[model samples]
Target: GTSKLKYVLQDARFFLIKSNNHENVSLAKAKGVWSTLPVNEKKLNLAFRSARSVILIFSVRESGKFQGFARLSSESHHIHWVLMLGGVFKIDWICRRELPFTKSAHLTNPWNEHKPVKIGRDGQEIELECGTQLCLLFPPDESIDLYQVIHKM
Candidate 1:
């Protein structure tokens, strides 16, 4: 009932997401709704509109690996008793991969082990050049990130 893409082209903007719990991620996939901070939602909306394509990179912080990527299906805002907690998006996954990797110096960017959050923020744009390889970290957690193997290296 779902189709998955084989490649992540550069024509779209991408974001990294971390979840300590895979159950929550599973629910998000089943419901097609993803929740995040209001600040993140605003930034995502801007990117979704400007880039004409926005993909959220989902990974489990606990598992320490890349899970998959999903597209922003619609622009829908959610309210919480007069305060805007955040917005929800119709999530249509583009690709699903479970390539397990770590952020060792040999694999990714080194972060301030004391406060790794100093290096990452929610919805940060990941710019990758051709032939480049490095792990990308997301906010709310530091243990989670995206990494790939360099066969030639």
Candidate 2:
């Protein structure tokens, strides 16, 4: 029973940690084939959480989409985004479809405060960061829930 419990805990589990100000942190980790590249338009904006980063499978989409809108149903499970250049040495976590490549992207604070900035098309290839993973902050809002299968038997 102990081993079974350990095994279960080994997989990503979401839990809360106390904060100095007593405000709980929020976070999520999702891995599914991105049906479309994220773009900023209208009232909708995309940004990473503080201290967060991502692992985008840049050259992904191997084949056709079998079912579902997310496209994780048939492809893009085994891929990772890497850079051709070597600069900063950082590694953490963020959603792939979250952040923007443009430098002037609108960013927000942990309390969901927004910063307005114009975005561009191209961006430097690098591991992402501006927020908090390995920082002096508390645990994120939701514990990372790594989904196995949407509909299982």
Candidate 3:
């Protein structure tokens, strides 16, 4: 069997480099997606691991018994809140039924340890750093587990 390898590139985000594959780095360049050659994982990982970013997806629901209650579900499969310190980009999946676009103090305050910012309602358009495939869907359940459907590259 051929030995295949995977690599990463940086341009404010991480990109994939594939070796011994049908569609590889040359393919990516042809697609006008890459700006430079791939870099070592250590370089890319260190830069991101140093300043870590937080992404929050908030869905506006109309009415429910738990209307005022907000839940945070992390799209990462391994762990929850405590994972942020590890420097991986953590996304707090939020689905709430509220009016206007105010952020909850309880939710926004704790992330201060990570210096998280106040994100606006147009959160759906945020781009992920590492080509992580994440989808935000509105489900009928009020539970925290419904929102995470992230598949990391």
Candidate 4:
């Protein structure tokens, strides 16, 4: 006899939190706004490591703009890095020094809409837990690089 499979569906909402001072804000009181996602972890890590003081490439997604956030704990730490990718764009390291980090429409809406939270220790690969979901800008077939940095506080 052939068996039938049953599935359940639920409604969910997405939110975004912005901070003028990243460290000062309390997680409990952080503002939540509607947002979207589409990014990959491997590719995001590669794009983030090009910066000088990236401790961990925490979150990467694309909603209205190609948005990225990282934990920067270093002497040269500049904090968050947000890029808008409609076409070609350039980022200035200093006031006048500029360089193009990515070319073409590399930044776009993620293919997936949710990602699983992750945790890992030093010298160990980051393990994505089961039942976790992440939004990706492109299809899963695209390949991106991964990078990591350790900071001592």
Tens-digit lDDT track for model 3 on 36-133? 12232333344334332222332223321111112112221211111012222232222333323233222221212322112322222223431222
TM-scores of the models, in the given order? 0.62, 0.19, 0.18, 0.17
Model 1 clash number: 0
What is the lDDT, from 0 to 100, of the residue 85 in candidate 2? 20
* RMSD value for candidate 4: 18.2
lDDT for 10 in candidate 2 is 28
Least well predicted 10-residue stretch by lDDT in candidate 4 = 1-10
Q: What's the true lDDT of residue 1 in model 3?
A: 9
Off by over 4 Å in 4: 1-9, 27-132, 135-153
Q: Write the per-residue lDDT of candidate 1 for residues 1-153, one digit (tens) a residue.
A: 111121233456667676667776777766767877778888788877775456777767657666666667677565121113576777665445454544422432233232322123545555432102322221122222222211101
Tell me the TM-score of model 1: 0.62
Query: What RMSD, rounded to one decimal, does every model reach?
Result: 9.7, 17.0, 17.7, 18.2
Best by lDDT: 1
Candidate 4 or 1, higher lDDT: 1
Query: Any idea what lDDT model 4 has?
Result: 0.21
Per-residue lDDT over 40-144 for candidate 4, one digit per residue giving the tens place of the 0 to 100 score: 232223433443322221222221221322232221211122322111111111011111223212322122232222221111222222111121221222121
